[PDB]
Coordinates of C-alpha atoms in Angstrom, one line a residue:
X1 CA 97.3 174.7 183.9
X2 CA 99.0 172.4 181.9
X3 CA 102.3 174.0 182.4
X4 CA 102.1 173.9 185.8
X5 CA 101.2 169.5 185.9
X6 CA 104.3 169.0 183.4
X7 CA 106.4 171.0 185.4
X8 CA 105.3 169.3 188.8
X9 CA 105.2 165.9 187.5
X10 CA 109.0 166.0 185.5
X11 CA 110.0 167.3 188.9
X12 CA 108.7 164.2 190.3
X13 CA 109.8 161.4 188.0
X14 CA 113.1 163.4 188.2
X15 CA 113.2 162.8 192.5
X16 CA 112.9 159.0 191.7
X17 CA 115.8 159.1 189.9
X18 CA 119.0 158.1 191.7
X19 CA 121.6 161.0 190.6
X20 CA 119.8 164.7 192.0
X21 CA 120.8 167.8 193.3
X22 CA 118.7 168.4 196.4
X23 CA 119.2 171.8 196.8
X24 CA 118.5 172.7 193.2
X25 CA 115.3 170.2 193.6
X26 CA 114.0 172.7 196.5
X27 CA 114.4 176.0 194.7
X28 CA 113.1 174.7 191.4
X29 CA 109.6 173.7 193.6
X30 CA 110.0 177.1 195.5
X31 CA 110.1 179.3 192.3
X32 CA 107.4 176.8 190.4
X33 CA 105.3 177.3 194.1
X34 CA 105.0 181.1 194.0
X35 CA 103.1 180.4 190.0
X36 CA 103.9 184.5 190.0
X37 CA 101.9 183.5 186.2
X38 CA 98.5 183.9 186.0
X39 CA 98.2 179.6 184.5
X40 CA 100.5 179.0 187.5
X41 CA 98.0 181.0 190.3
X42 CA 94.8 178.6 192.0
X43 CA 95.0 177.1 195.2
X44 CA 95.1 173.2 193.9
X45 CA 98.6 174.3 192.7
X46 CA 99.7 175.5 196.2
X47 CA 98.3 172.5 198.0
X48 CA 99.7 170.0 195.2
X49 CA 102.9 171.7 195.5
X50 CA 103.3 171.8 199.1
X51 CA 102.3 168.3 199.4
X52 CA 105.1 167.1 197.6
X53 CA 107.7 170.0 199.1
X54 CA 107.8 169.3 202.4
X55 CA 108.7 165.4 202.1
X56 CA 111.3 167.1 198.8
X57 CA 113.3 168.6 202.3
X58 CA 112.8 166.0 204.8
X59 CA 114.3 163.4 202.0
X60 CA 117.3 165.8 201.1
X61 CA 118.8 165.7 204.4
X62 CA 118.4 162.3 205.2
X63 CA 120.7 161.2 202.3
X64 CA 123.3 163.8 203.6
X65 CA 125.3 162.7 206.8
X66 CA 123.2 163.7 210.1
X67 CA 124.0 167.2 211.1
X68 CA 121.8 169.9 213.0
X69 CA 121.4 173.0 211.7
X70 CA 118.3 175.4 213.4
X71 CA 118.1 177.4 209.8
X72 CA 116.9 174.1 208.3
X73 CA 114.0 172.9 210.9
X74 CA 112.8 176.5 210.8
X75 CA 111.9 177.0 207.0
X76 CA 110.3 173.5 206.7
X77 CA 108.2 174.5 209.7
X78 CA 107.0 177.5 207.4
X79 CA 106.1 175.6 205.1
X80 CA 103.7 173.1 206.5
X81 CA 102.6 176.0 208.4
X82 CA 101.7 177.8 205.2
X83 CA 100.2 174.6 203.8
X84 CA 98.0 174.5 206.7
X85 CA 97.0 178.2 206.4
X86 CA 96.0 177.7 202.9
X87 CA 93.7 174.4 203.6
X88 CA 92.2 176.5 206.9
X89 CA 91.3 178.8 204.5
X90 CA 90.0 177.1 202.5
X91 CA 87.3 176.1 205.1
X92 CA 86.7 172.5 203.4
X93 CA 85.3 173.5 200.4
X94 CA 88.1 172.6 198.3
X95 CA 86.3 168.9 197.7
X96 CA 83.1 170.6 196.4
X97 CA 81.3 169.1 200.1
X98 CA 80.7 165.1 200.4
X99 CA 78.2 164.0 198.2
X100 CA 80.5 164.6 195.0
X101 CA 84.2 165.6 196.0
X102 CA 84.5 165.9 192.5
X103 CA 83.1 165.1 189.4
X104 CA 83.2 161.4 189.3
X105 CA 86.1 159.2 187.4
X106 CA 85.8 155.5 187.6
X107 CA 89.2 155.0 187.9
X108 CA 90.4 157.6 191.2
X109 CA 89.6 156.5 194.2
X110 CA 89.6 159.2 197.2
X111 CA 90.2 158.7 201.3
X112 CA 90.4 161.3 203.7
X113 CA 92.9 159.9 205.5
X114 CA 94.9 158.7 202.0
X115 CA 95.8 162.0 201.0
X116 CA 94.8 164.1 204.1
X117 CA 96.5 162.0 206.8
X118 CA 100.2 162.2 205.0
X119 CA 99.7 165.9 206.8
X120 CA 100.3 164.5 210.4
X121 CA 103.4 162.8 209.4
X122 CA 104.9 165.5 208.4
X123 CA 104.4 167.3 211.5
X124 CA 105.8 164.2 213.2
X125 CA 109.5 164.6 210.7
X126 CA 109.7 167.6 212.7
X127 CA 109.2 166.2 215.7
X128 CA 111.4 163.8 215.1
X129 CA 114.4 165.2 213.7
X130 CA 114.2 168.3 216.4
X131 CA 114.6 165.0 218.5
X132 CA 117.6 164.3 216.9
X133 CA 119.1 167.4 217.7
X134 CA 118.4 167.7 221.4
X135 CA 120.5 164.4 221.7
X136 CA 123.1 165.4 219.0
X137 CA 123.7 169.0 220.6
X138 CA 126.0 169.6 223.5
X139 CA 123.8 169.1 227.3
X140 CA 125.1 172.2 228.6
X141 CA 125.6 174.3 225.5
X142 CA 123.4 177.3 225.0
X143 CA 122.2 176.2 222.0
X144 CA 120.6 173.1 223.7
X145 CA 118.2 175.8 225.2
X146 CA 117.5 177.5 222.0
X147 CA 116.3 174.0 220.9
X148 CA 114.2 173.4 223.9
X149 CA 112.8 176.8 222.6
X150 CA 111.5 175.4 219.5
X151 CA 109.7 172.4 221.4
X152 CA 106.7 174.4 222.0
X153 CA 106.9 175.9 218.3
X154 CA 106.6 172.1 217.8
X155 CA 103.8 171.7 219.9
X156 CA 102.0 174.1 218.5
X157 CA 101.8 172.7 215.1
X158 CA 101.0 169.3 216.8
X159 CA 97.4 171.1 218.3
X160 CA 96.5 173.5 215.3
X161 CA 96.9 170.2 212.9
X162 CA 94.7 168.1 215.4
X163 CA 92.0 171.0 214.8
X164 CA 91.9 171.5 211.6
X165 CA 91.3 167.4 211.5
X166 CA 88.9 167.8 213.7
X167 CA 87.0 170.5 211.5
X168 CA 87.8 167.8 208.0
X169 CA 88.8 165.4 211.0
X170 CA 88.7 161.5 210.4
X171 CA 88.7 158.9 212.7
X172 CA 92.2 157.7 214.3
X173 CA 93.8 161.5 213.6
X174 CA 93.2 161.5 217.3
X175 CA 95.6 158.9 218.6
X176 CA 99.0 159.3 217.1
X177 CA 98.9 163.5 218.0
X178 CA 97.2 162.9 221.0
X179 CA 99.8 160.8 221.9
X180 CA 102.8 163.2 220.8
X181 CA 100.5 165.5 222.6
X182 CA 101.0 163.7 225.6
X183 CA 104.9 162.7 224.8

């Protein structure tokens, strides 16, 4: 337990300072994820540490000069795919049903779409930088193909997401992946 939220949360403070090593930022959440320890192991430890993961590698790249590499759009696509295949089965019982998500604090306040509609942007990063590549690349290199290859691996994502908020789904999920949908 309380390793586990010291751990996460000096990793955290730690990203909002200025001077970081991105890669070592990324395996240090990747061998805290796995929680191989038995403190570590409960599925509120997965979901927290996925949730702050993904956005960990979207970030890292950014500060770096733009470059394409298809290693690097295909491991982040694991991971929300993994996060997603943990909350699916999880069948919405993770926030003990609607009447009490949780026992009550006066201080937290919960929304649906607060903490379960960062999930679409994600999918949309990857969108977005695959973008970047099919302009970046070469028009008649091979690899340009390859790339068109992953679009539908993209699409993919973009329906299975759209589900699962329809099964926990709140209002206005709908029209930003309908529209990518239809992009």
């Amino acid at each position: 337990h309380a390793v586990v939220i010291k751990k996460l949360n000096e990793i955290l403070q730690a990203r909002g300072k200025k001077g970081t090593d991105r890669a070592a930022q990324i395996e240090l959440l990747q061998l805290l994820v796995q929680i191989a320890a038995e403190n570590n192991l409960g599925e509120g430890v997965i979901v927290k540490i996925k949730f702050n993961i993904i956005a960990s590698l979207y970030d890292y790249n950014p500060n770096l000069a733009t470059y394409m590499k298809p290693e690097m759009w295909g491991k982040c696509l694991d991971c929300i795919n993994e996060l997603m295949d943990i909350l699916f089965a999880n069948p919405n019982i993770f926030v003990g049903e609607n009447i009490l998500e949780e026992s009550e604090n006066l201080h937290n306040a919960d929304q649906p779409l607060r903490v379960r509609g960062c999930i679409l942007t994600l999918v949309e990063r990857m969108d977005e930088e695959f973008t970047k590549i099919m302009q970046n690349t070469d028009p008649h290199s091979q690899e340009y193909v390859e790339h068109l290859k992953d679009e539908a691996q993209v699409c993919a994502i973009i329906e299975r997401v759209q589900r699962y908020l329809e099964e926990k789904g709140t209002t206005e999920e709908v029209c930003r992946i309908y529209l990518l949908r239809i992009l």
